[PDB]
Design a protein around this ligand. Structure first.
Ligand SMILES: NS(=O)(=O)c1ccc(OC[C@@H](O)C[Te]C[C@@H](O)COc2ccc(S(N)(=O)=O)cc2)cc1
Ligand SMILES: NS(=O)(=O)c1ccc(OC[C@@H](O)C[Te]C[C@@H](O)COc2ccc(S(N)(=O)=O)cc2)cc1
Ligand SMILES: NS(=O)(=O)c1ccc(OC[C@@H](O)C[Te]C[C@@H](O)COc2ccc(S(N)(=O)=O)cc2)cc1
Ligand SMILES: [Zn+2]
Length: 259
Protein backbone atom coordinates (compact mmCIF):
# COMPACT_ATOMS: atom_id res chain seq x y z
CA UNK A 1 0.00 0.00 0.00
CA UNK A 2 1.05 3.69 -0.40
CA UNK A 3 3.16 4.91 2.59
CA UNK A 4 4.92 7.89 0.94
CA UNK A 5 4.73 11.29 2.62
CA UNK A 6 6.83 14.35 3.51
CA UNK A 7 8.63 13.11 6.68
CA UNK A 8 12.35 12.22 7.08
CA UNK A 9 11.38 8.52 6.81
CA UNK A 10 8.93 8.64 3.82
CA UNK A 11 9.66 11.99 2.13
CA UNK A 12 10.87 13.03 -1.33
CA UNK A 13 14.35 11.42 -0.90
CA UNK A 14 12.64 7.97 -0.46
CA UNK A 15 10.03 8.16 -3.23
CA UNK A 16 12.32 6.76 -5.99
CA UNK A 17 12.39 3.31 -4.31
CA UNK A 18 8.65 2.74 -5.05
CA UNK A 19 8.34 5.26 -7.94
CA UNK A 20 11.56 5.02 -9.96
CA UNK A 21 10.30 7.75 -12.42
CA UNK A 22 11.22 10.10 -9.51
CA UNK A 23 14.71 10.18 -11.17
CA UNK A 24 13.21 10.65 -14.69
CA UNK A 25 13.91 13.16 -17.48
CA UNK A 26 10.88 15.45 -16.96
CA UNK A 27 10.28 15.70 -13.19
CA UNK A 28 8.60 18.59 -11.39
CA UNK A 29 8.85 21.01 -9.76
CA UNK A 30 11.87 22.95 -11.09
CA UNK A 31 13.62 26.23 -10.37
CA UNK A 32 12.56 28.87 -12.92
CA UNK A 33 15.70 30.81 -13.88
CA UNK A 34 14.08 34.04 -15.12
CA UNK A 35 17.28 35.00 -17.05
CA UNK A 36 17.42 31.65 -19.00
CA UNK A 37 13.65 31.38 -19.76
CA UNK A 38 13.01 32.68 -23.29
CA UNK A 39 10.07 34.78 -24.51
CA UNK A 40 8.20 32.66 -27.07
CA UNK A 41 6.14 34.77 -29.53
CA UNK A 42 4.53 31.52 -30.89
CA UNK A 43 2.55 30.99 -27.62
CA UNK A 44 -1.20 31.68 -28.27
CA UNK A 45 -3.15 33.72 -25.65
CA UNK A 46 -4.04 31.77 -22.38
CA UNK A 47 -7.83 31.26 -21.93
CA UNK A 48 -9.07 30.50 -18.39
CA UNK A 49 -12.86 29.88 -18.73
CA UNK A 50 -14.23 29.17 -15.20
CA UNK A 51 -17.64 31.02 -15.50
CA UNK A 52 -19.62 27.68 -15.35
CA UNK A 53 -17.36 25.92 -12.78
CA UNK A 54 -19.28 23.56 -10.44
CA UNK A 55 -17.37 22.79 -7.22
CA UNK A 56 -18.60 19.68 -5.35
CA UNK A 57 -16.57 18.85 -2.27
CA UNK A 58 -13.38 19.43 -0.27
CA UNK A 59 -11.32 16.39 0.85
CA UNK A 60 -8.29 15.97 3.19
CA UNK A 61 -6.40 13.16 1.37
CA UNK A 62 -3.54 12.96 3.94
CA UNK A 63 -1.16 14.90 1.62
CA UNK A 64 -3.09 18.17 0.97
CA UNK A 65 -6.75 19.18 0.63
CA UNK A 66 -8.50 19.04 -2.77
CA UNK A 67 -11.48 21.10 -3.89
CA UNK A 68 -13.13 18.80 -6.43
CA UNK A 69 -15.18 19.89 -9.46
CA UNK A 70 -17.79 18.37 -11.78
CA UNK A 71 -15.67 17.47 -14.86
CA UNK A 72 -18.48 15.51 -16.64
CA UNK A 73 -18.84 18.44 -19.17
CA UNK A 74 -16.72 21.43 -20.44
CA UNK A 75 -17.84 23.67 -17.47
CA UNK A 76 -14.44 25.02 -16.36
CA UNK A 77 -11.69 24.71 -18.98
CA UNK A 78 -8.18 25.88 -19.75
CA UNK A 79 -7.18 26.47 -23.39
CA UNK A 80 -4.58 28.42 -25.36
CA UNK A 81 -1.05 29.26 -24.29
CA UNK A 82 1.10 26.18 -25.02
CA UNK A 83 -1.97 23.88 -25.06
CA UNK A 84 -3.55 21.97 -27.98
CA UNK A 85 -7.33 21.51 -27.42
CA UNK A 86 -9.40 21.65 -24.24
CA UNK A 87 -8.39 20.83 -20.65
CA UNK A 88 -11.13 20.37 -17.99
CA UNK A 89 -10.68 21.46 -14.36
CA UNK A 90 -10.95 18.46 -12.02
CA UNK A 91 -9.52 19.80 -8.69
CA UNK A 92 -7.31 22.36 -7.04
CA UNK A 93 -5.05 22.05 -4.02
CA UNK A 94 -2.11 23.81 -2.38
CA UNK A 95 1.37 23.03 -1.09
CA UNK A 96 2.63 25.12 1.86
CA UNK A 97 5.33 25.52 4.50
CA UNK A 98 5.75 25.51 8.28
CA UNK A 99 6.94 29.17 7.98
CA UNK A 100 6.36 31.90 5.38
CA UNK A 101 9.90 31.47 3.81
CA UNK A 102 9.06 28.04 2.33
CA UNK A 103 6.14 26.08 0.92
CA UNK A 104 6.17 26.50 -2.86
CA UNK A 105 7.25 23.65 -5.13
CA UNK A 106 8.42 25.77 -8.06
CA UNK A 107 10.99 28.45 -7.20
CA UNK A 108 11.83 31.65 -9.10
CA UNK A 109 15.58 32.40 -9.18
CA UNK A 110 15.71 30.05 -6.10
CA UNK A 111 13.05 32.14 -4.26
CA UNK A 112 10.57 30.00 -2.31
CA UNK A 113 7.05 31.37 -1.77
CA UNK A 114 4.86 30.65 1.28
CA UNK A 115 2.59 28.35 -0.77
CA UNK A 116 1.62 27.29 -4.28
CA UNK A 117 -1.87 26.69 -5.72
CA UNK A 118 -2.29 23.94 -8.36
CA UNK A 119 -5.39 24.02 -10.59
CA UNK A 120 -5.36 20.56 -12.22
CA UNK A 121 -6.91 20.01 -15.69
CA UNK A 122 -7.09 16.98 -18.01
CA UNK A 123 -7.03 16.84 -21.83
CA UNK A 124 -10.59 15.97 -23.02
CA UNK A 125 -9.11 14.08 -26.04
CA UNK A 126 -8.31 11.20 -23.56
CA UNK A 127 -11.88 10.99 -22.17
CA UNK A 128 -11.09 10.65 -18.41
CA UNK A 129 -8.40 11.74 -15.93
CA UNK A 130 -7.05 8.17 -15.43
CA UNK A 131 -6.35 7.79 -19.20
CA UNK A 132 -4.96 11.37 -19.38
CA UNK A 133 -2.22 10.74 -16.75
CA UNK A 134 -0.83 7.98 -19.06
CA UNK A 135 -0.16 10.53 -21.85
CA UNK A 136 2.71 13.07 -22.19
CA UNK A 137 0.15 15.87 -22.91
CA UNK A 138 -2.55 14.50 -20.58
CA UNK A 139 -2.66 17.23 -17.91
CA UNK A 140 -2.26 20.99 -17.64
CA UNK A 141 -1.53 22.32 -14.14
CA UNK A 142 -1.90 26.07 -13.57
CA UNK A 143 0.46 26.99 -10.74
CA UNK A 144 0.03 30.20 -8.73
CA UNK A 145 2.42 31.40 -6.03
CA UNK A 146 1.14 32.68 -2.66
CA UNK A 147 2.97 35.38 -0.67
CA UNK A 148 1.90 36.59 2.76
CA UNK A 149 0.56 40.14 2.89
CA UNK A 150 -3.05 41.33 2.49
CA UNK A 151 -5.89 38.76 2.76
CA UNK A 152 -7.26 37.14 -0.43
CA UNK A 153 -11.05 37.50 -0.11
CA UNK A 154 -11.68 34.67 -2.62
CA UNK A 155 -9.69 32.26 -0.40
CA UNK A 156 -11.71 32.83 2.82
CA UNK A 157 -14.51 30.29 2.04
CA UNK A 158 -11.75 27.63 1.71
CA UNK A 159 -10.01 28.73 4.98
CA UNK A 160 -13.31 28.64 6.92
CA UNK A 161 -14.20 24.99 6.02
CA UNK A 162 -10.74 23.54 6.96
CA UNK A 163 -11.65 22.87 10.62
CA UNK A 164 -14.35 20.41 9.25
CA UNK A 165 -11.69 18.34 7.35
CA UNK A 166 -8.86 18.36 9.90
CA UNK A 167 -7.76 14.71 9.39
CA UNK A 168 -7.04 12.30 6.51
CA UNK A 169 -10.18 10.96 4.81
CA UNK A 170 -12.55 13.73 6.01
CA UNK A 171 -14.62 15.54 3.36
CA UNK A 172 -17.26 18.30 3.36
CA UNK A 173 -19.77 19.70 0.87
CA UNK A 174 -18.15 22.59 -1.02
CA UNK A 175 -20.65 23.79 -3.61
CA UNK A 176 -20.87 27.20 -5.32
CA UNK A 177 -17.18 28.07 -4.91
CA UNK A 178 -15.80 30.34 -7.70
CA UNK A 179 -12.11 29.52 -8.37
CA UNK A 180 -11.72 32.81 -10.36
CA UNK A 181 -11.27 34.51 -6.94
CA UNK A 182 -7.86 32.73 -6.54
CA UNK A 183 -6.22 34.24 -9.69
CA UNK A 184 -3.90 37.27 -9.84
CA UNK A 185 -4.64 40.17 -12.25
CA UNK A 186 -2.01 39.10 -14.85
CA UNK A 187 -1.95 35.76 -16.76
CA UNK A 188 1.76 36.23 -17.71
CA UNK A 189 3.32 32.75 -17.30
CA UNK A 190 6.24 30.38 -17.70
CA UNK A 191 5.65 26.92 -19.23
CA UNK A 192 7.62 23.69 -19.43
CA UNK A 193 6.95 19.94 -19.74
CA UNK A 194 6.98 18.08 -16.41
CA UNK A 195 5.34 15.71 -14.01
CA UNK A 196 2.98 15.23 -11.11
CA UNK A 197 4.89 16.50 -8.03
CA UNK A 198 3.64 13.60 -5.83
CA UNK A 199 3.69 9.85 -6.38
CA UNK A 200 3.05 8.40 -8.86
CA UNK A 201 5.20 11.24 -10.36
CA UNK A 202 3.83 10.56 -13.88
CA UNK A 203 5.42 12.60 -16.69
CA UNK A 204 2.07 13.81 -18.07
CA UNK A 205 1.93 17.56 -17.22
CA UNK A 206 2.22 20.76 -19.20
CA UNK A 207 3.11 23.20 -16.39
CA UNK A 208 1.82 26.79 -16.69
CA UNK A 209 3.21 28.83 -13.75
CA UNK A 210 1.91 32.41 -13.37
CA UNK A 211 4.55 35.10 -12.80
CA UNK A 212 2.35 37.25 -10.52
CA UNK A 213 1.81 35.80 -7.02
CA UNK A 214 -1.42 36.27 -5.09
CA UNK A 215 -1.30 37.80 -1.60
CA UNK A 216 -2.92 35.91 1.31
CA UNK A 217 -2.91 36.94 4.98
CA UNK A 218 -0.77 35.33 7.73
CA UNK A 219 -4.11 34.31 9.36
CA UNK A 220 -5.21 32.51 6.15
CA UNK A 221 -2.01 30.45 5.78
CA UNK A 222 -1.93 29.73 9.57
CA UNK A 223 -5.28 27.92 9.09
CA UNK A 224 -3.70 25.68 6.38
CA UNK A 225 -1.02 24.71 8.97
CA UNK A 226 -3.67 23.49 11.50
CA UNK A 227 -4.63 20.56 9.21
CA UNK A 228 -3.31 17.08 9.98
CA UNK A 229 -1.60 14.49 7.76
CA UNK A 230 -2.88 11.74 10.09
CA UNK A 231 -6.33 10.18 10.38
CA UNK A 232 -8.71 10.82 13.34
CA UNK A 233 -7.47 9.02 16.49
CA UNK A 234 -3.81 8.77 15.29
CA UNK A 235 -0.96 10.88 16.80
CA UNK A 236 -1.30 14.47 15.52
CA UNK A 237 1.19 15.40 12.71
CA UNK A 238 0.57 18.95 11.40
CA UNK A 239 0.09 19.14 7.60
CA UNK A 240 3.02 21.49 6.87
CA UNK A 241 5.92 21.32 4.39
CA UNK A 242 3.94 19.18 1.92
CA UNK A 243 6.17 20.35 -0.99
CA UNK A 244 8.68 18.51 -3.20
CA UNK A 245 11.93 20.44 -3.78
CA UNK A 246 13.15 21.52 -7.23
CA UNK A 247 14.26 18.65 -9.51
CA UNK A 248 16.89 18.65 -12.27
CA UNK A 249 15.83 20.54 -15.43
CA UNK A 250 17.80 18.12 -17.69
CA UNK A 251 17.04 18.67 -21.36
CA UNK A 252 14.15 21.12 -20.98
CA UNK A 253 13.50 24.74 -21.91
CA UNK A 254 11.23 27.00 -19.88
CA UNK A 255 9.34 29.45 -22.12
CA UNK A 256 7.94 32.84 -21.05
CA UNK A 257 4.65 34.27 -22.40
CA UNK A 258 5.95 37.83 -21.77
CA UNK A 259 8.90 40.07 -22.60
TE1 LIG B 1 8.39 3.78 9.02
C1 LIG B 1 8.00 5.20 7.47
C2 LIG B 1 7.56 4.45 6.24
O1 LIG B 1 6.51 3.58 6.64
C3 LIG B 1 8.66 3.55 5.72
O2 LIG B 1 8.17 2.71 4.69
C4 LIG B 1 8.18 3.37 3.46
C5 LIG B 1 7.35 2.90 2.47
C6 LIG B 1 7.33 3.52 1.23
C7 LIG B 1 8.14 4.62 1.01
S1 LIG B 1 8.13 5.46 -0.55
N1 LIG B 1 9.32 4.81 -1.55
O3 LIG B 1 6.86 5.14 -1.19
O4 LIG B 1 8.46 6.85 -0.29
C8 LIG B 1 8.97 5.11 1.99
C9 LIG B 1 8.98 4.47 3.22
TE1 LIG C 1 -15.70 12.77 -14.69
C1 LIG C 1 -15.27 12.97 -12.46
C2 LIG C 1 -16.34 13.65 -11.48
O1 LIG C 1 -17.27 14.70 -11.88
C3 LIG C 1 -15.50 14.27 -10.38
O2 LIG C 1 -14.55 13.24 -10.12
C4 LIG C 1 -13.45 13.54 -9.36
C5 LIG C 1 -12.70 12.44 -8.98
C6 LIG C 1 -11.58 12.63 -8.22
C7 LIG C 1 -11.23 13.91 -7.84
S1 LIG C 1 -9.77 14.21 -6.84
N1 LIG C 1 -10.07 13.79 -5.20
O3 LIG C 1 -8.75 13.31 -7.35
O4 LIG C 1 -9.54 15.63 -6.71
C8 LIG C 1 -11.97 15.00 -8.23
C9 LIG C 1 -13.09 14.82 -8.99
N1 LIG D 1 0.73 2.19 -15.38
S1 LIG D 1 1.30 3.80 -15.28
O1 LIG D 1 0.83 4.60 -16.39
O2 LIG D 1 2.65 3.91 -14.75
C1 LIG D 1 0.28 4.45 -13.98
C2 LIG D 1 0.79 4.52 -12.71
C3 LIG D 1 -0.02 5.04 -11.71
C4 LIG D 1 -1.30 5.47 -12.00
O3 LIG D 1 -2.11 5.99 -10.98
C5 LIG D 1 -3.22 6.78 -11.53
C6 LIG D 1 -4.04 7.51 -10.46
O4 LIG D 1 -4.72 8.73 -11.13
C7 LIG D 1 -3.16 8.09 -9.38
TE1 LIG D 1 -2.71 9.71 -10.46
C8 LIG D 1 -4.21 10.75 -9.34
C9 LIG D 1 -3.74 11.09 -7.99
O5 LIG D 1 -5.01 11.67 -7.64
C10 LIG D 1 -2.72 12.19 -7.93
O6 LIG D 1 -3.11 13.28 -8.74
C11 LIG D 1 -2.24 14.34 -8.69
C12 LIG D 1 -2.69 15.47 -9.32
C13 LIG D 1 -1.93 16.61 -9.35
C14 LIG D 1 -0.69 16.62 -8.75
S2 LIG D 1 0.31 18.09 -8.81
N2 LIG D 1 0.88 18.41 -7.31
O7 LIG D 1 1.43 17.79 -9.68
O8 LIG D 1 -0.58 19.15 -9.23
C15 LIG D 1 -0.25 15.50 -8.08
C16 LIG D 1 -1.01 14.34 -8.05
C17 LIG D 1 -1.78 5.38 -13.28
C18 LIG D 1 -1.00 4.87 -14.29
ZN1 LIG E 1 0.23 20.01 -6.44
Amino acid sequence: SHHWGYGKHNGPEHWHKDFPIAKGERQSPVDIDTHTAKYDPSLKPLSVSYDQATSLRILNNGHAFNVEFDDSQDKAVLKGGPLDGTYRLIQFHFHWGSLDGQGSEHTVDKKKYAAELHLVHWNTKYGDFGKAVQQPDGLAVLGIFLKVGSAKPGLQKVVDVLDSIKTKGKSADFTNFDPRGLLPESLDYWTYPGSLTTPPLLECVTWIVLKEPISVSSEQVLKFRKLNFNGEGEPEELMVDNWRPAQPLKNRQIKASFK
